[PDB]
Amino acid sequence: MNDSEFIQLADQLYQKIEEKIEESGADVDYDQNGSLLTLEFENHTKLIINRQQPLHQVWLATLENGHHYDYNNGKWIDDRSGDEFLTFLSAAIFKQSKETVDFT
Template sequence: MTDLEYADHADALLLQIEQACDQITEESDVDLDAQRVGGMVTIVFPNRSQIVINQQRPLHEIWLAAKAGGFHFKFDGQAWQDTKGQGEFFAMLNRFATEQAGEPLNFSA
């Protein structure tokens, strides 16, 4: 993957996350605050816990940090997959966000 291809896919991912946060806030009782600074999105939950997603341009990866730990993802041509085989990005984000919010949340690809 070229640097430009990585940037396009990574920027699209961060935009999807921001839009999903807005939709969740509009359609549920969970008030998420998504703050984007450059290549990083911080999701702040009502209990003040956070999930941080950021671009790692030199490695062509996306990193996700949640209460459950830190995870690295690479784009496989169709989706962002955990580099240690633990799953797809949005499936893992849904699980961690649900745990931190205390109710089901759905971030979709």
């Protein structure tokens, strides 16, 4: 994967997260600031998603831990756990808002 393609895939990922938040009607605020996509919940907690172009990775920061994802198999995959990014994100959103956003 080159830089231009990573950009395409990551842009699609960010729009999908934003779109699915819209489909869901969930009370999750989103703001993209450059490479960052910040999700804020009504309890003032946050999930921060960051693009790292030179590594062709997407990074997620939860309240406890950081996670780094590769595009594998048409999906974004955690490089330690093998967990898929969007399944994991749905669960994190749920833990912090108890609202439900499906990205599948």
